[PDB]
Amino acid sequence: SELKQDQYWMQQAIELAKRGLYSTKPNPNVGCVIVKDDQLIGEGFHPKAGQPHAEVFALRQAGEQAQGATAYVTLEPCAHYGRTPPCAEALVKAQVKKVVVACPDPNPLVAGKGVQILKNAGIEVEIGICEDLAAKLNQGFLKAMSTGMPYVRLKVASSLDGRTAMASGESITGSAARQDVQHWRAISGAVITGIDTVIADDCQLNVRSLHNIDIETVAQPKRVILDRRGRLPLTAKILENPETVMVMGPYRQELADLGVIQLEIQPLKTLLQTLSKQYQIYDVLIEAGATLSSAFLQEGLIDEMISYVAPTLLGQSARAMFNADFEYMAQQLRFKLLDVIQLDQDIRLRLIPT
Amino acid sequence: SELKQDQYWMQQAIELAKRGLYSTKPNPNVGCVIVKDDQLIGEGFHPKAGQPHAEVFALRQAGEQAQGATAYVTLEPCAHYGRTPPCAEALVKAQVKKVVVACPDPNPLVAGKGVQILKNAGIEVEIGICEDLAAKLNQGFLKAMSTGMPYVRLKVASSLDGRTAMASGESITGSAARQDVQHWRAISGAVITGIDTVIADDCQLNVRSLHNIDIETVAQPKRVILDRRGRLPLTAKILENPETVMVMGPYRQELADLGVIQLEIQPLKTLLQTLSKQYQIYDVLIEAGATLSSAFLQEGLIDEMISYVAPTLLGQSARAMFNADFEYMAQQLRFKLLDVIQLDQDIRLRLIPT
Ligand SMILES: Nc1nc2c(ncn2[C@@H]2O[C@@H](COP(=O)(O)O)[C@@H](O)[C@H]2O)c(=O)[nH]1
Ligand SMILES: Nc1nc2c(ncn2[C@@H]2O[C@@H](COP(=O)(O)O)[C@@H](O)[C@H]2O)c(=O)[nH]1
Ligand SMILES: Nc1nc2c(ncn2[C@@H]2O[C@H](COP(=O)(O)O)[C@@H](O)[C@H]2O)c(=O)[nH]1
Ligand SMILES: Nc1nc2c(ncn2[C@@H]2O[C@H](COP(=O)(O)O)[C@@H](O)[C@H]2O)c(=O)[nH]1
Ligand SMILES: O=C([O-])C(=O)[O-]
Ligand SMILES: O=C([O-])C(=O)[O-]
Ligand SMILES: O=C([O-])C(=O)[O-]
Ligand SMILES: O=C([O-])C(=O)[O-]
Ligand SMILES: C[As](C)(=O)[O-]
Ligand SMILES: C[As](C)(=O)[O-]
Ligand SMILES: [Cl-]
Ligand SMILES: [Cl-]
Ligand SMILES: [Zn+2]
Ligand SMILES: [Zn+2]
């Protein structure tokens, strides 16, 4: 089947795209393979902002044999000049016979323009092959470019009885869960937390450990601290790397002098739009306490909740994970369960609102 | 390997034992295969109290060819007369060459006596083959016979935030979890609940639905209701089948006239010992509210907790699953996680105290 061969090669391209997962932000993960007479002649992936696009690497490998070949690309070749020349033009120049595209461009202001340039040159273009699987490569980018809002993941860690701490915030989950969290942080443009967490935990919320990846190649998440009374202590550990920190609160000259980006107090929905529009942050991880976590949930600002549950009971006086006060069952916040996995002694659920 | 062949056949016997899982109580699940010249000549399992033991069925099949053969039995052949003749004597009579035993007898007053009868006849006896796997056939019976206390499973159903109901007991988990609970009920000699649950839910706590098993062959759990003020309404659904009901509370002639077994108010640990010693109940399922469930937990009376968690948030005013008031993290009740599975939209954890 010609469809199944197209799917076979696009799946190779989707695999290449994953080599950049942690280093591409704000740019999309993109793979590309070039195939001729059923033979692979060029592979490429986008490693990092400012570096060449996937198609460019793949063509450099393919060389002159790219003429008459088929290019499989997980995303629509670009039609504009920025830090690099446009990919649609490179494919034309290489005189490929056919370009197969998984996802069209999510930005409505440019969508279809790359394909159009291919149509004009007489290049065969078919679109939609393994689109579902390719979309999983770019949940944040695709959402942010099509709607102006980032993809938001809420992380929570609790006991079996749904508690996050004793009455006084003494603290559940183990090292396997901690390692898993590294992955979620490393695909995020920002980790959002509240001042309460920073004061209680003195956390860094950064990426320090990943499987099969050198941490120096990681594009680190910005640490976004919601601090409405401007209480962030200057000695906080989260401030050792100040240029990757943003504080939402009353303007403090101490913070500006350190290079910390300061945001005016704004509604959570507006905050998310700001991060996407002004700061190119398309994947957000929330790592916060009950109050801030519940605010995001109740305002309907969560795309996915990642819940770590530890095999322990903390009792009815320990801190509730979700602090809404509901009366009737009809008010419950129901989610669709995607999956559950075991992480040593903990478990992790992934959940999508309904 | 002679060990691996012994293991191969014992595993066939362990499999046969499972055919009686739901109908054997209070008797143990027991399988038996008879093998000669590497050929299976007889299989047997114990189906139900009063019926022949596994070895008897297997020998009836083996017939005269049982002479010189090897018998694999998941539990030590009995050495005493009750409702049936003793199995040790049947094997001798059949003139088997060798008897392979997984689990020795758990009752210390009779342990080794069956083996002794085999030793005396010159019959080869080796013991311990796939013991771990065979023990899983009889968690309750083996515990109760060796210690006088039943194996106790605590079932709980909660939201992700560890809640069981709204402030007023309005009620989470779905049909897949409900079906799973049927299995746990069907291996139990008793389901224990409190009056609060009976009043709120009007539950039956019986077995009505099982995979690949006719419900008429099931030996139903007794429904044990803890009712210290004697409030059980005579119109309660749990009372439609009164002879399988036990109430712990102040004596009521209304209940005796219906045939309900009445227990005097006693401590929970004493209650469990009573059920085992006086009523031959070796596997207990607790299906109760927060108060009674927490009492069992805090008194250290739980062997295993089976926790069903639904993908929903009920909020901080909904009923806590565990009502202890702890202050420090050191007071937490920690469990070892055995496994987690997905049940459609819910999950189930199995947990063992530490
Ligand atoms: N690559 C990767 N994926 C992880 C990790 N931890 C959890 N996951 C998630 O768990 C798997 C679930 O499959 P999915 O349905 O998301 O494709 C992965 O796809 C990924 O989303 C991790 O450490 N590395
Ligand atoms: N046979 C059976 N086992 C179940 C069912 N639901 C849960 N289980 C448990 O889940 C599996 C876990 O394997 P185990 O470690 O207990 O041998 C089974 O062994 C059994 O204990 C059920 O409906 N039928
Ligand atoms: N903890 C915390 N909650 C916030 C913050 N900003 C907004 N919220 C909560 O989000 C909800 C809606 O407020 P808005 O997002 O419209 O400002 C309110 O319940 C508010 O308390 C914040 O910076 N920190
Ligand atoms: N809800 C409930 N709790 C009980 C019952 N029997 C004992 N408990 C609880 O178990 C704990 C120890 O009491 P004991 O088991 O020594 O009578 C106490 O906290 C007590 O309230 C009962 O029948 N129902
Ligand atoms: O990033 C690269 O080096 C590539 O795609 O070859
Ligand atoms: O600092 C606070 O209290 C806040 O952010 O709301
Ligand atoms: O129970 C039976 O009928 C058996 O074991 O053959
Ligand atoms: O009925 C009650 O309140 C009880 O059992 O404790
Ligand atoms: C598919 As592209 C964003 O590398 O032109
Ligand atoms: C192993 As038996 C209890 O059937 O004698
Ligand atoms: Cl916080
Ligand atoms: Cl109860
Ligand atoms: Zn491009
Ligand atoms: Zn017997």
CSV table of N, CA and C in Angstrom, one decimal, chain B residues 91-169:
chain,number,residue,atom,x,y,z
B,91,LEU,N,-4.3,-42.1,49.4
B,91,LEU,CA,-3.0,-42.2,48.6
B,91,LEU,C,-2.2,-43.4,48.9
B,92,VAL,N,-2.1,-43.8,50.2
B,92,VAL,CA,-1.5,-45.1,50.6
B,92,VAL,C,-2.2,-46.3,49.9
B,93,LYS,N,-3.6,-46.3,50.1
B,93,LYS,CA,-4.4,-47.3,49.5
B,93,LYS,C,-4.2,-47.5,48.0
B,94,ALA,N,-4.1,-46.4,47.3
B,94,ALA,CA,-3.8,-46.3,45.9
B,94,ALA,C,-2.4,-46.7,45.5
B,95,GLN,N,-1.5,-46.9,46.6
B,95,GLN,CA,-0.1,-47.3,46.4
B,95,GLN,C,0.7,-46.4,45.5
B,96,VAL,N,0.6,-45.1,45.7
B,96,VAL,CA,1.4,-44.1,44.9
B,96,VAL,C,2.9,-44.3,45.4
B,97,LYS,N,3.8,-44.0,44.5
B,97,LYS,CA,5.2,-44.0,44.8
B,97,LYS,C,5.7,-42.8,45.5
B,98,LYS,N,5.1,-41.6,45.1
B,98,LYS,CA,5.5,-40.3,45.6
B,98,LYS,C,4.4,-39.3,45.6
B,99,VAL,N,4.4,-38.5,46.7
B,99,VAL,CA,3.4,-37.4,46.8
B,99,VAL,C,4.2,-36.1,47.0
B,100,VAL,N,4.0,-35.1,46.1
B,100,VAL,CA,4.6,-33.8,46.1
B,100,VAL,C,3.6,-32.8,46.7
B,101,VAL,N,4.0,-32.0,47.7
B,101,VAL,CA,3.2,-31.1,48.4
B,101,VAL,C,3.7,-29.7,48.4
B,102,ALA,N,2.8,-28.7,48.0
B,102,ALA,CA,3.2,-27.3,48.0
B,102,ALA,C,3.2,-26.7,49.4
B,103,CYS,N,2.1,-26.6,50.0
B,103,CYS,CA,1.9,-26.0,51.4
B,103,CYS,C,1.7,-27.1,52.4
B,104,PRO,N,2.5,-27.0,53.5
B,104,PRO,CA,2.2,-27.9,54.6
B,104,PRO,C,0.8,-27.4,55.3
B,105,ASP,N,0.3,-28.2,56.2
B,105,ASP,CA,-1.0,-27.8,56.8
B,105,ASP,C,-0.7,-26.6,57.7
B,106,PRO,N,-1.6,-25.6,57.6
B,106,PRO,CA,-1.4,-24.4,58.4
B,106,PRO,C,-1.8,-24.6,59.9
B,107,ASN,N,-2.7,-25.5,60.2
B,107,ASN,CA,-3.2,-25.8,61.5
B,107,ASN,C,-2.0,-26.5,62.3
B,108,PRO,N,-1.5,-25.8,63.3
B,108,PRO,CA,-0.3,-26.4,64.0
B,108,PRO,C,-0.7,-27.7,64.8
B,109,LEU,N,-2.0,-27.8,65.1
B,109,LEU,CA,-2.4,-29.0,65.9
B,109,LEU,C,-2.4,-30.3,65.0
B,110,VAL,N,-2.4,-30.2,63.7
B,110,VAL,CA,-2.4,-31.3,62.8
B,110,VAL,C,-1.3,-31.3,61.8
B,111,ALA,N,-0.5,-30.3,61.8
B,111,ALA,CA,0.6,-30.1,60.8
B,111,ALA,C,1.6,-31.3,60.8
B,112,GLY,N,1.9,-31.8,59.7
B,112,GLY,CA,2.9,-32.9,59.5
B,112,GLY,C,2.4,-34.4,59.7
B,113,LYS,N,1.1,-34.5,60.2
B,113,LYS,CA,0.5,-35.8,60.5
B,113,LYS,C,0.1,-36.5,59.2
B,114,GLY,N,-0.3,-35.8,58.2
B,114,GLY,CA,-0.6,-36.4,56.9
B,114,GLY,C,0.7,-36.9,56.2
B,115,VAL,N,1.7,-36.0,56.2
B,115,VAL,CA,3.0,-36.4,55.7
B,115,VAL,C,3.6,-37.6,56.4
B,116,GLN,N,3.4,-37.6,57.7
B,116,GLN,CA,3.9,-38.8,58.5
B,116,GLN,C,3.3,-40.1,58.1
B,117,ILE,N,2.0,-40.1,57.8
B,117,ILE,CA,1.3,-41.3,57.3
B,117,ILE,C,1.9,-41.8,56.0
B,118,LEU,N,2.3,-40.8,55.1
B,118,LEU,CA,2.9,-41.2,53.9
B,118,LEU,C,4.3,-41.7,54.1
B,119,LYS,N,5.1,-41.1,55.0
B,119,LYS,CA,6.5,-41.6,55.3
B,119,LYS,C,6.4,-43.0,55.8
B,120,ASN,N,5.5,-43.4,56.7
B,120,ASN,CA,5.3,-44.7,57.2
B,120,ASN,C,5.1,-45.8,56.2
B,121,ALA,N,4.3,-45.5,55.1
B,121,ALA,CA,4.0,-46.4,54.1
B,121,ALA,C,5.1,-46.6,53.1
B,122,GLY,N,6.2,-45.9,53.3
B,122,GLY,CA,7.4,-45.9,52.4
B,122,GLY,C,7.2,-45.0,51.2
B,123,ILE,N,6.2,-44.1,51.2
B,123,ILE,CA,5.9,-43.2,50.1
B,123,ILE,C,6.8,-42.0,50.2
B,124,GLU,N,7.5,-41.7,49.0
B,124,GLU,CA,8.3,-40.6,48.9
B,124,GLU,C,7.5,-39.3,49.1
B,125,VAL,N,8.0,-38.4,50.0
B,125,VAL,CA,7.4,-37.1,50.2
B,125,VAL,C,8.4,-36.0,50.1
B,126,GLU,N,8.2,-35.1,49.2
B,126,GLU,CA,9.0,-33.8,49.2
B,126,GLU,C,8.0,-32.6,49.2
B,127,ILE,N,8.4,-31.6,50.0
B,127,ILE,CA,7.5,-30.5,50.4
B,127,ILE,C,8.1,-29.2,50.0
B,128,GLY,N,7.3,-28.2,49.5
B,128,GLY,CA,7.7,-26.9,49.3
B,128,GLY,C,7.7,-26.4,47.8
B,129,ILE,N,7.4,-27.3,46.9
B,129,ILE,CA,7.4,-27.0,45.5
B,129,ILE,C,6.3,-26.0,45.1
B,130,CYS,N,6.7,-24.9,44.5
B,130,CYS,CA,5.8,-23.8,44.2
B,130,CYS,C,4.9,-23.4,45.4
B,131,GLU,N,5.5,-23.4,46.6
B,131,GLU,CA,4.8,-23.0,47.8
B,131,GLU,C,4.3,-21.6,47.8
B,132,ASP,N,5.1,-20.6,47.4
B,132,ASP,CA,4.7,-19.2,47.3
B,132,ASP,C,3.5,-19.0,46.4
B,133,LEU,N,3.4,-19.7,45.2
B,133,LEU,CA,2.3,-19.5,44.3
B,133,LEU,C,1.1,-20.2,44.8
B,134,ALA,N,1.3,-21.4,45.5
B,134,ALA,CA,0.2,-22.1,46.1
B,134,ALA,C,-0.5,-21.4,47.3
B,135,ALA,N,0.4,-20.8,48.1
B,135,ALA,CA,-0.1,-20.0,49.2
B,135,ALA,C,-1.0,-18.9,48.8
B,136,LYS,N,-0.9,-18.3,47.6
B,136,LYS,CA,-1.7,-17.3,47.1
B,136,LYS,C,-3.2,-17.8,46.9
B,137,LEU,N,-3.3,-19.1,46.8
B,137,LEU,CA,-4.6,-19.8,46.7
B,137,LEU,C,-5.4,-19.7,48.0
B,138,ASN,N,-4.8,-19.4,49.1
B,138,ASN,CA,-5.4,-19.6,50.4
B,138,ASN,C,-4.9,-18.6,51.4
B,139,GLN,N,-4.8,-17.3,51.0
B,139,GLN,CA,-4.3,-16.3,52.0
B,139,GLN,C,-5.0,-16.3,53.3
B,140,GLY,N,-6.4,-16.3,53.3
B,140,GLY,CA,-7.2,-16.3,54.5
B,140,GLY,C,-7.0,-17.6,55.3
B,141,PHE,N,-7.3,-18.7,54.7
B,141,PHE,CA,-7.2,-20.0,55.4
B,141,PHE,C,-5.9,-20.3,56.1
B,142,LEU,N,-4.8,-20.0,55.3
B,142,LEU,CA,-3.4,-20.2,55.9
B,142,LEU,C,-3.1,-19.3,57.0
B,143,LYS,N,-3.6,-18.1,56.9
B,143,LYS,CA,-3.4,-17.1,58.1
B,143,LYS,C,-4.2,-17.5,59.3
B,144,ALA,N,-5.5,-17.8,59.1
B,144,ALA,CA,-6.5,-18.1,60.1
B,144,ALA,C,-6.1,-19.3,60.9
B,145,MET,N,-5.6,-20.3,60.2
B,145,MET,CA,-5.3,-21.6,60.8
B,145,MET,C,-4.0,-21.6,61.6
B,146,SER,N,-3.1,-20.7,61.1
B,146,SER,CA,-1.8,-20.5,61.8
B,146,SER,C,-1.8,-19.5,62.9
B,147,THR,N,-2.7,-18.5,62.8
B,147,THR,CA,-2.7,-17.4,63.9
B,147,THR,C,-4.0,-17.2,64.6
B,148,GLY,N,-5.1,-17.8,64.1
B,148,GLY,CA,-6.4,-17.5,64.7
B,148,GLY,C,-7.1,-16.2,64.3
B,149,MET,N,-6.5,-15.5,63.3
B,149,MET,CA,-7.1,-14.3,62.8
B,149,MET,C,-7.3,-14.3,61.3
B,150,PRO,N,-8.4,-13.8,60.8
B,150,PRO,CA,-8.6,-13.9,59.4
B,150,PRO,C,-7.7,-12.9,58.6
B,151,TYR,N,-7.6,-13.2,57.3
B,151,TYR,CA,-7.0,-12.2,56.3
B,151,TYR,C,-8.0,-11.2,56.0
B,152,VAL,N,-7.7,-9.9,56.3
B,152,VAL,CA,-8.6,-8.8,56.2
B,152,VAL,C,-8.3,-7.8,55.0
B,153,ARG,N,-9.2,-7.7,54.1
B,153,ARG,CA,-9.1,-6.7,53.0
B,153,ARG,C,-10.0,-5.6,53.2
B,154,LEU,N,-9.5,-4.4,53.1
B,154,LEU,CA,-10.2,-3.2,53.3
B,154,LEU,C,-10.4,-2.6,51.9
B,155,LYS,N,-11.7,-2.5,51.5
B,155,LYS,CA,-12.0,-1.8,50.3
B,155,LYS,C,-12.4,-0.3,50.6
B,156,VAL,N,-11.8,0.6,49.8
B,156,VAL,CA,-12.2,2.0,49.8
B,156,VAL,C,-12.4,2.5,48.4
B,157,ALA,N,-13.3,3.5,48.2
B,157,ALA,CA,-13.6,4.1,46.9
B,157,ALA,C,-13.6,5.6,47.2
B,158,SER,N,-12.7,6.3,46.4
B,158,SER,CA,-12.6,7.7,46.6
B,158,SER,C,-12.4,8.5,45.4
B,159,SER,N,-12.6,9.8,45.5
B,159,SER,CA,-12.2,10.7,44.4
B,159,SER,C,-10.7,10.9,44.5
B,160,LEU,N,-10.1,11.6,43.5
B,160,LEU,CA,-8.7,11.9,43.4
B,160,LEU,C,-8.3,12.6,44.6
B,161,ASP,N,-9.1,13.5,45.1
B,161,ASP,CA,-8.8,14.3,46.3
B,161,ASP,C,-9.1,13.6,47.6
B,162,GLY,N,-9.3,12.3,47.5
B,162,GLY,CA,-9.4,11.4,48.7
B,162,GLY,C,-10.8,11.5,49.5
B,163,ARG,N,-11.8,11.9,48.8
B,163,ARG,CA,-13.1,12.1,49.4
B,163,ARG,C,-14.1,11.0,49.0
B,164,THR,N,-15.1,10.7,49.8
B,164,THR,CA,-16.0,9.6,49.6
B,164,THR,C,-17.5,10.0,49.4
B,165,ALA,N,-17.8,11.3,49.6
B,165,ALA,CA,-19.1,11.8,49.6
B,165,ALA,C,-19.2,13.3,49.8
B,166,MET,N,-20.2,13.9,49.4
B,166,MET,CA,-20.4,15.3,49.8
B,166,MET,C,-20.8,15.4,51.3
B,167,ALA,N,-20.7,16.6,51.9
B,167,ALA,CA,-21.0,16.8,53.3
B,167,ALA,C,-22.2,16.0,53.8
B,168,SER,N,-23.3,16.1,53.1
B,168,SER,CA,-24.4,15.2,53.3
B,168,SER,C,-24.2,14.0,52.3
B,169,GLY,N,-24.1,12.8,52.8
B,169,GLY,CA,-23.6,11.6,52.1
B,169,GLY,C,-24.1,11.3,50.6
